[model samples]
Target chain A: ETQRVGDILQSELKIEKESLDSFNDFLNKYKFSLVETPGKNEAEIVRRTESGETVHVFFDVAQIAFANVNVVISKSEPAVSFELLMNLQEGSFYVDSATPYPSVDAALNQSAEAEITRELVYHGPPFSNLDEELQESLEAYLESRGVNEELASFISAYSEFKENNEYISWLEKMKKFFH
Target chain B: ETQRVGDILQSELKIEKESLDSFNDFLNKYKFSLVETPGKNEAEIVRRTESGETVHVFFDVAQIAFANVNVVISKSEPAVSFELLMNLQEGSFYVDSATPYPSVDAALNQSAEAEITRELVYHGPPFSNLDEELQESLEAYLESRGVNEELASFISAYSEFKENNEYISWLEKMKKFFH
Candidate 1:
């Protein structure tokens, strides 16, 4: 009934801008073991076996690693403009601000979805869900092997998470089993 | 290799304490979403299948909502205090200043890692990876239902990840498959 822990001292309410003093203090407090600006390096993306997994993918449309990010007091005006100086990757990346990658907050349904949708729209309709290329490869592989249709279908469905363009190459390797 | 994309601004740098305007602008630019805190009234947990594949189970930790997070900032301080505060779970989430979480960056690995190690030491050890009691229930339910022991173990492992603390219940139902 009562507010359990709603007392979050939102800094936005106090400091119009982040306090560099406080930030420096935080660094002093922790003794600064980690590095500044890892620069989206060592970043990666992977599917979790379940929920609650951390998404560590890079998805920045564009960003500027501003020095003294903590020093900025508050916006009297947008003195620095990163938008103009930044370059955008055309088809290889999508543009969005909702949840760019390497940020913990935005994942899955966030900016990633927007970028994917944009790619799909710009490129016309998506390929068929039951892709002929994939199915044909599977069918041929199974037929070549002594194994029948059922086992191949089961494995194909289960192994959908494997990311690689060459589905046929994989099928070719296994095709002999059916024969 | 060819130069990777997005290296144009690699060398350009701004003075430390660049400006409050940028950080303030970030405050306005970003979006916010709140999760339910645990052990709070009116708290509800939703367990659903997300994307029709992964299970989504979210708990409202209302305790965090009502908890107090204090920020003690200073540029002139030593790293002594940071060591003491790392023990708190509700404390700064991480020491990354860029992290919007209440956390500040000291980057103190020893203290942070020590606190984590301390927690593991206090909690004791993991039992059976799926919780001992739950695993036994799984073993029993599968054994009774006439599911071969192997299949039961496979299902139990999957259930352990899909729905923690429900391995026994899942195992019971799994036995029905045998009947």
Candidate 2:
């Protein structure tokens, strides 16, 4: 039943492939014209402060997804922000006046992957859907019935992570003691 | 015997893959336990001042056997210096008592592979290795190869690029030409 609703939501949220391409193409075209690291589709940023003049350098951030599932894409340090970006769902592309977090490298990259990342970063707050909300939902999700204690510990460690970054927080914790 | 001697010496001088891996693994296993996010694996010099803690990072600058042979394995950004505990080369490790750069994520971590694209900011003079030396060498190589005009233009661009990065340098020229 929820799958049916999600299907509707995905379609409603979806943009045409051509439109997505053109939006990305615009970013790429503008990116090339700028003096960014020559051929790199880089973190979108202007190096004005460092250069003390106009520098059309854009640090690229990319996010790629396929088959209605987000493909775990690339990132750079610190991983917190980009992880958020990498796991984003699809949404609309826009022409914005001022950036929210230009200081964050991956945020500015705005790759399709980045776009999704950004979308989630801004929009993943509200628990509009009943199926995905609250700590009880989290406990149920974390119950590793078939998975081993290693997996359970992994989930346990991660459960302590940040409120917003539930899964990531736990994963980051497990990463510490895993080895 | 130069080739054989050179090969021996080169092998002697180079950071071994296994050694690099072991130290890398140790660091991978160890230090990041202390911090949340582990980035690079270079050693950092820390100075305590009333203002705050500061990090001075430097790269392992090596002179290659050949003038044109500049191999930059990785750059240690000035802000974060990582010194893997195992020490790839004995003399190369442990600059001061402060600390080696601690990476938050393990190198093999899938998340880590994504987060490794941190940019190397160029702040003029004495580049970390022969790569810096080769920036000039490139012009020399080009001039020697009968591309003097191209070399001259490249030199002019590089000289200007010394202060303003490649991004701003182009704009400085283009502004006069266009706007």
Candidate 3:
């Protein structure tokens, strides 16, 4: 059935508008205000709770016009990734080139018995688009958090590829062996 | 104690980057990959689990630069609001300035045993952000899921306010009556 995009957006939010204001506030109390990046029309709004759990909300110019938006409350911040594969016909929102998060999508497809198997891998930024500063920080973070080494090395390799801007080339080279 | 921005971000994630990739994927399997919102550099990545539980992940460009970024996971997808009052020095993220998520914050703050008291009301999107068309869907959803009306009406009034884009004004106007 046909529906106004705005109407659909509203329901998707799952909370009352008046209450939303308070809800968003509760979520933002611990973080810094959304900060705009130079040359960009959006900003990164961060928040941490009294417990020091951090949350980030990315807002754009158009979204600011509404008094309410949609949000999902999970037990913990949901897992995040810069890369994903997407099916617009069946999905709500998306990222780079219509890619959707993999793990979430993969399990669902399997549940529906959709006959999908191969892992469709692709990298956007954060992963395929990392710069030296980011990778180094990630590596350092792993160390700080006491992450295991094997995983660290695996990530570092990818990090090196991003810094060199050679992820595509790496993928192509790796694909040669499979073919 | 001064710290590099990246270090702070890593800790805020509360999980290893590699693990997050797996975790986010697990959630996204049910939802579509992140989508590119028009006129914006990010997307809304959504998914639902077998139990009909939902989740949303908000992403941005600047965040991609570091092979790292921000996210908010909910117990349930929330109804979002536009107006927020923020304490920037104390907050971690925001939009248009100092707006914050109220209800979520209030409950948590009180849990800390601090000198604070207030009933911060709020909602998750599917409940508060519905429109004329969406409300019917939600009502049907409630019935199908065996949800009761006491819960429905409680959610509806606040929802209309959010969708109407008058929540902030509503709060401001309602405050005058208390005197």
Candidate 4:
């Protein structure tokens, strides 16, 4: 019976390793620095502008796949924030909330734990409620800051890669616990 | 400017507290003991049978919105395992994988970390691949262990409650960080 369980684990480990190998190619292609906290479900992509501005894109693959994202652009007196829900397959993002913060430091220190409860906060009116021209300009603003179709693709691929790594780690832990 | 941020947090806190107050009624109705690890995304419902068997149903509200559930029924020499993907709105559950383990202790010790990586493991053939008679019998077996429509309702309600609590906690943390 133990042999049967071992066989299942071995087979899974082999498949997972092969998948992980292919993911490295995608990782090498991405330019942004990926930040991961050990044992945490979320991750971040940090990009620094030549002008010294910093853009932090925080996300988690565990919930809603790679759809939900929080972007914080800092360095200026008031940091800009964009709460996006991406359609990764279509390489499109819907802006849920776009707001400006009083302090860049406060916005940088903000955690992603309240991501799911975004409706609870009154950041601003719904994206759809904004005038068409304002919406277009906000979209353009994000695009200028490097939030575009390519970034969506990177996020989609990275989510799959990180989730796979977490799976391997979980498998190893289980093996030890059961052994 | 900081006052504006404070107002937003205060309004959200009021709404969250009101919603949490209403969730207490649902909690009082549920009979099973809930197990939650602080700062973790997952939770479990533990039920003990009169015959000393323990049924552990683990799930997460983060990924699939309380749809995926893992059930391990232990106390026998070999524990029974069931992987269920639920349709919370319809009060239905689809059995993805069903198998038996070599040891009850090992199965009990199994963590929910691999819950997302379930497809990697070859537990058995798909539930649909099983013989029709066997599928019906297995469904009946689960119902006998109290895994049914009522439990589905309980999970759905509990997930919302817990998620609200997490959101409230996050808001409090953010208030402090921003302050």
Which candidate has the top score in lDDT? 4
Model 2 off-target regions past 4 Å? A1-120, A123-133, A144-150, A153-179, B1-179
Model 1 residue A1 CA deviation (Å) reads 28
Ranking by TM-score: 4, 3, 2, 1
Best by TM-score: 4
- Model 4 C-alpha lDDT per residue in residues A1-179, reported as the tens digit of each score: 76677677777888988854334444444445778875567888777766567778888866635378889876636566778998867878888976555566545554443333232233544568544654665677677767787677767777776787888887777666555
Query: Stretches of candidate 1 above 4 Å error?
Result: A1-179, B1-164, B169-179
Quote model 3's iRMS.
16.8
Per-residue lDDT value at A145 in model 1: 25
Shift in Å, residue B86, candidate 1: 10
- lDDT tens digits, residues A31-86, model 3? 34545454333334454444343333343332232111111111122222222222
Q: For candidate 4, give the docking quality class from DockQ.
A: incorrect
Best-to-worst lDDT order: 4, 3, 2, 1
Tell me the TM-score of model 2. 0.17
Per-residue CA lDDT of model 2 for B115-168, tens digit only, reads 343222211112232133323432342223222233222222222323233333
Model 2, span A18-67: residue lDDT tens: 13344335334323232333212222222222213222222222212011
DockQ of each: 0.01, 0.01, 0.01, 0.02
